Amino acid sequence: SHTDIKVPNFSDYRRPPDDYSTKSSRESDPSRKGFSYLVTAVTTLGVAYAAKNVVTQFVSSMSASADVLAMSKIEIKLSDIPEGKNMAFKWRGKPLFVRHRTKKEIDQEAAVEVSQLRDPQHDLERVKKPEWVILIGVCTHLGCVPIANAGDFGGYYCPCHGSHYDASGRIRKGPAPLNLEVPSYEFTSDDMVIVG
Amino acid sequence: TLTARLYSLLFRRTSTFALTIVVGALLFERAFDQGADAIYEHINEGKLWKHIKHKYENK
Amino acid sequence: YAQALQSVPETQVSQLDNGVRVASEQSSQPTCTVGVWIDAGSRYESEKNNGAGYFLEHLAFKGTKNRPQNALEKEVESMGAHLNAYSSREHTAYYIKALSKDVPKAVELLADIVQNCSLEDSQIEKERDVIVRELQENDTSMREVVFNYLHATAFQGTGLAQSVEGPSENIRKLSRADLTEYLSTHYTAPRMVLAAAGGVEHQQLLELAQKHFGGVPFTYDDDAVPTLSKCRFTGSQIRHREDGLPLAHVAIAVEGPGWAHPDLVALQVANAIIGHYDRTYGGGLHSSSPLASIAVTNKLCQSFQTFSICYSETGLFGFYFVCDRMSIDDMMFVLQGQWMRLCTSISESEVLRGKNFLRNALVSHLDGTTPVCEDIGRELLTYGRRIPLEEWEERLAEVDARMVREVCSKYIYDQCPAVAGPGPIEQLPDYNRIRSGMFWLR
Amino acid sequence: LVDPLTTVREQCEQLEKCVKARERLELCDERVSSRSQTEEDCTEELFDFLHARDHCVAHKLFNSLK
Amino acid sequence: RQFGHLTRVRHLITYSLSPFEQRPFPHYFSKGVPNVWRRLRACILRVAPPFLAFYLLYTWGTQEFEKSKRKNPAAYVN
Amino acid sequence: SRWLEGIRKWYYNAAGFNKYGLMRDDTIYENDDVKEAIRRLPENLYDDRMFRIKRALDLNMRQQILPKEQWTKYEEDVPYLEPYLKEVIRERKEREEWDK
Amino acid sequence: SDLELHPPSYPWSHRGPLSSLDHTSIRRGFQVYKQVCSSCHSMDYVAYRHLVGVCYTEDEAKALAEEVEVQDGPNEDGEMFMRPGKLSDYFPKPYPNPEAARAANNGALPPDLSYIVRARHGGEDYVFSLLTGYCEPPTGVSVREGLYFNPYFPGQAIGMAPPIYNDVLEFDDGTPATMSQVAKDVCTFLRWAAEPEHDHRKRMGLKMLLMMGLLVPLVYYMKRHKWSVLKSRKLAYRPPK
Amino acid sequence: APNIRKSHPLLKMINNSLIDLPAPSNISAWWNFGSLLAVCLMTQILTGLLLAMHYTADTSLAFSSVAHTCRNVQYGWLIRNLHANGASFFFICIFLHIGRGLYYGSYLYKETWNTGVILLLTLMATAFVGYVLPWGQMSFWGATVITNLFSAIPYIGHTLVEWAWGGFSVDNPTLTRFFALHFLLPFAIAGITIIHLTFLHESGSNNPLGISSDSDKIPFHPYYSFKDILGLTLMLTPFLTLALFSPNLLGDPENFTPANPLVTPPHIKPEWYFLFAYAILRSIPNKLGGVLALAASVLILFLIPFLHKSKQRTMTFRPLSQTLFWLLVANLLILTWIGSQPVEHPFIIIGQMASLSYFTILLILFPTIGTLENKMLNY
Amino acid sequence: PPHPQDLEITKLPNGLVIASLENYSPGSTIGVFIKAGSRYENSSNLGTSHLLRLASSLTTKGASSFKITRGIEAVGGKLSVESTRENMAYTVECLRDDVEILMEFLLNVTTAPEFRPWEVADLQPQLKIDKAVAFQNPQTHVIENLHAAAYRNALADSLYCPDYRIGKVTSVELHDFVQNHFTSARMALVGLGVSHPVLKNVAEQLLNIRGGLGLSGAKAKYRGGEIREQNGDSLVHAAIVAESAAIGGAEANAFSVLQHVLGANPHVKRGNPFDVSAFNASYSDSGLFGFYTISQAAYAGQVIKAAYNQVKTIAQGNVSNENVQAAKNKLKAKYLMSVESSEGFLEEVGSQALAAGSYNPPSTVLQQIDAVADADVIKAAKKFVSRQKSMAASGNLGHTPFVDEL
Ligand code: HEM
């Protein structure tokens, strides 16, 4: 018939010693689940660890390149740069500006309405000798090389998206966000100058 | 009762479960790392630069 | 309304120095029903004793010593009364419906059966071959075999996994003695209940019972009622496959709390929510019961029903569906999903309906003499006293959504379920699948 | 200053095996340089010697080096 | 080939238990390790042979080569 | 000198498919002819063969086998499919022959 | 004759899967390389930069780089010109090109000891045996002019004369500069030279083992757990009558 | 459909290939190689692609570029190591996979099997190129022979060559195009790997008993997803132990010497996973014959399916062919050893012997022992 | 205070009988009894009855299919339709205040059906199954046919739509069927657990039709039909009848009594594994009387003969005035008992309030059953043996006799 079928004995055969009738399965196993999920929890855990690192590694596997240089110092004969002109030098992976400013330029650069600047800084706090201005030839917007002796502010201009810079290297008009970078530098004599 | 308290709180709700995996991973890390390093460095005393760093930085 | 509830007559009870509790609810109704509801069942049978209570049921009527077959039936037939009965796993009952103008006559008759069955060794040997047949019918009621199996595995190893009818071996070999053994052992006053409903007057009933149930207890034992062995639930499965059958049945459940436990109310409201469906209804727009709705839209089942079958100290909260060989899965999936929804994100809107629907069955549960009697009998036997629809009203009128979740999750969430499935069940996925179906990827 | 190598090689050139080889060699050497026209070489013999020698030179030499 | 359309199967009953109700561990020692052996011993005599054999051919062959490398004491006794 | 009979019982126990509790015919790979044969198989024998195979799968999947007692014996192995199979083949060869 | 002598095995302080490199011993090796080998052997893939933090100090290595003048970029008139070696330069080639070296070495070509240890079977064991291992050719065997016998080298006649003998230099750490000793220190250098990772790589292997160890078992329990439902399972054939 | 795991043109694919996919209940480890294989294809593509970010296809820079990648790119050494050794765990796995298949008649599933043979071939080809990439002695001389290997084809030969690689001798042109093939082929592998599984899924996976498994069959997921993630970690520990403890264990040191177009080193040994073939090539003293023999050594796989005579699929109940099987596996193992040896009498012969036992154990013994066992059953 | 509150009846000017009865039960159940049915069908439109029976939940002019089902359910209601060859009862049940709510839907369902061409063309396939399940009980098959052989016209029509017409019932045929029968004069707004003033104050909206009897079925012509369904079910079903007894029809109570007089007789008059009873259907202008016998196949002929002889000799004076005494008592029970369950009781107060307009108290209803005895019965049985007989059968029948063989 069917009244004749019976579920076999899974006794010691399998069942964990908290499951052998006359006493609730409940209350017992709902502790057993704990263990069986603990293994699991932990595995996800260990795996997590493993994963976190394989990614970390395989992520720095490009970020930079353990091939980084340094050259912080460069000597420049200030007489190479006569009044009115800006010379561009090869330096540390990006251009470097060194300019001889005229009476007029230095004057206009101080005459700048500082409270109205995108990046507020007075010409005199950005340079040491007012007839000498030094800048990093990289536009702050998206990285193009600003063109010296171009633009509406007698400083520079970036042909990529139209940022206008002054003789102080400050951003005035256009999209650039902050003023041109001023490197670390000092004059070792009358016609000598060192950047970095 | 660890297991039971662990299940009842941590493992039961799929929510909680994960959340502890994260917090658990954190602890497992800090802990596993320090240790492995220890074990490691120990098994190599005085051979590491960390260990010699001193003949130009004492020990 | 609430008044309609309060204005309903109280249920009278009164125990004998015997053990027999006599309860009854009165009404105008000429007719009525009366009976004895024993605390006997297959759960009380042994390995060799399994079947008794049933084989017995089949002779309880075929006459007593006092009045042989011809006489009992004749005396009953002749008075236009109906004497019918049944035997479950933990509850046996014998009842008659007469014109109350016979409370006394019926009572005596009842008494004469729970006490003096002929048990004619000849009448037996005949009922033997009858049950053995009747049992062969029971077999092709897939709707049934599916539940026995459920118990068969959900309570594997304990008394509850034994079916009421009993193995075909026991039926073929029970002895005139065994039936008596069963009788004399379990049909004792402290466990039986004389209940009745109709135009009967309690007192007359007392005195009548008090008069034909002249039982007498000497020892302390006589006066005490034995508590059964506890039944171990076991999240497991039993698959009796046959792709020969028209379609497949599936039933899955969790261990339930047991009569006593107050949550069975909250829990009752839950099952009220997903409800039950059948292809004859009239509502692909059905009430919430998405299972139903989804059942309808996606033609998932021929039928499905929810249930909280409960016992003294355990029980089975689950569901059952019938379906084409082909939609078994989506059905389980879609349904098991509803269990989660139920204890994970049930709304007030639902319980609101849930409750009322219940209160509607709560009521029609007592629709007539017999049914009412059926509750008093059960009530006392399992709850202790009677539970007034005014009580049930309160109990379940205080269930809020939050409470349903609380409970359903308490009894459903991440529990290892019991599955049963006969038929062309190849499409039903392994246990693990339907197991991880118990926790929602909340 | 004395190279623990030569020191340990001394000891090692006396372990049973070596002597066995050294001899086997000494014979080959004085056996070839003894004739005016022969193709034989004493590389083999020499190797067996060396091999056995340095083998222990190696199982101890690094103990005395810093 | 999906589920529900694989074969005509009839009259097979199976009984299984929640992984939480039994023990994955299982019965090592009782039935566990015994079967393991029941298998080493069952094929050790079908597998090893060819491998063992090669081993020899290996050893033989190399040795032979290594031997064929040394001088024949008598290649020039004169 | 040396009975093929003697040999067959050798191979039969050597093969060892009887340890899983299945007959010879339970193992024949199911190519076109076998499929058509098994398809003619009376429902008795079919359902048996099914169970037989499923039992085996379950054993194999457990790594265990049948207790020594239950292994079928060489002389008791029943070629329940061989006959049907042959007819199938000659039925076919006949067609093939004709289509020339 | 294809008859050769294979080098024995020395118990290098760094041999073991978990054992690092004797950094101090490498410092010396650097020295023996820098003061004696680096005049015939280029080591193109290494640079002062590496020494920093492994066996040397930044300022120490900086200064150590200064000692070399290197030919650098075009002027403003465009003309190679010399200048102090930066920390970034690689170790100095002793020759402009191979033929230049071959000329300066009786015709032979001294290899670049960058990947030498792993360009030769036996690595240090070999290189070590080679350096500390010259001698008189046994009888019948005559090594030609310009060569020198060394049984360890394939062919027995190398083009390199014994480059290392007692006192050839003075380990400033106050270590007995015996040939054997100084030969060891070179090799241990040569190894790190071939694979700076070495230490990192092993510490890594360690952690790896522990995880496999902790994870495979855990996922093993899990696999079992799930499968039980089947292993445990029980079939049964119950046809009608 | 409510499912969503069955109603999504894309999502269904996953839930139709890794979940719900019916798989025989009885499946041994010997079925793990495959998912591993796929993983190798991933590992490789990932690391390799990562490694190609720093390679520089060009004679004057190739070699050094690799070195720079290890010595300078953070973990570049780890990356290369994993890439280098993955090649191996890849062949190991593929080899085991082919084995399994051969000894369960998995080959009866023809298309799945034939595409397979294409994968082996491609894998082999993609692995030849690439090794040519770091441009060390081995890289170069490998390139010169394997390419020159096509010279044997008459007429269209010497031509195909002086086209195969750059112009008229392994040189820059032939390097830059190799980097290209190597970058391109792994994808073609993944491609064919899709087709492969496709023909597979048409017919269920096989199973060790060699008898229908429709009687059982579990949902891929709960089960095999786990079984595989396990096989993953097991065959992951060895390979990571190599890449971390003995990296050049399986890799010839000779290849640490930049290429010299004027000196092929004495003792040129092809990378292990190619030895057996190699062995066969040299031991049939003819440019052509040798080549044909080579051809056949691998190309033979296509005929395996037509050499099946057993009335049974797998050969679990074929004690006879069963040992014949291991004779072969070892026969192979020997050809490998023999392949790592110089050409002297102690060997050579052993060579052409094994290199023959191979072909017969396949074209002749097997089918024979085959029908034989049948008759020992009355078939 | 006692719950006695006489069931008031108030026939509105239309003819819409309204019978209530507050019984204070918590759950009340209202219901619209109608003199509709499958008896008013023609060669065509057949089954429209059945399809109408299922269109219960289709949209109305006051509420949509949706709202109606979810509205009734929102309260824990029940809306269902019970129907006979000559009467349709649309009941609905709930409780407390919700009765008021539950009504709107009931109202609309019976008076504002706007049977939408899609909703129906889209529902008809349901007949197929509704019928498929019904026919799972061989009893229904036999009886369906019985009536087919017992009659030749209305009432002999099927209760379950014939197959060939499953997809052909038009949206039209439905309205036309409602309009011609669902009229005030042949309807009744019966109900329980309700105050009568309340239940009346609703029949005011329910006023939206008048046409007394819209189509009045044709009288029922009798015939001694005989149809056999060879199908092999291991066990035969048989039913034998002879026209007789109309509802209200005096001669009726006789058979009800003969119905019980018979039984202990036919059953106890046939020995072996079987089942046999006294059949009795009382219709408006006719009825049927006899006996169905589920019997094992081969023992088919035996059982029907035996059970027939019993109805025979029970006519030839084989009835003790005692038999009649007992049987008169069983009816008293089966009547009274089968009135406990509020649905089977709302059936009494309704069935009457429609057929008559009155309400015979359980007193005289007995005084009427009591009223007759020995007097008839024996005679009632005679009428069976003499009148023409129409038999119906389902099963192997290879061993089942025909009427021409008695
Ligand atoms: C190129 C990489 C390859 C990958 C990623 C791969 C993967 C797979 C996968 C995922 C399976 C699943 C079952 C199993 O693992 O056994 C499979 C099966 C199979 N493959 Fe491949 N395979 C590749 C190459 C090959 C090769 C070279 C052969 C040819 C000998 C081959 C022959 C087969 C066969 C016979 C099966 C089906 C039989 C069975 O599953 O029992 N595969 N392949």
Ligand SMILES: CCCCCCCCO[C@@H]1O[C@H](CO)[C@@H](O)[C@H](O)[C@H]1O
């Ligand atoms: C699958 C198992 C994976 C194991 C996790 C790999 C651990 C790699 O961990 C590595 O350890 C180094 C030594 O401390 C650190 O310098 C690295 O930054 C760190 O990523």
Ligand code: FES
């Ligand atoms: S790039 Fe300088 S303006 Fe944008």
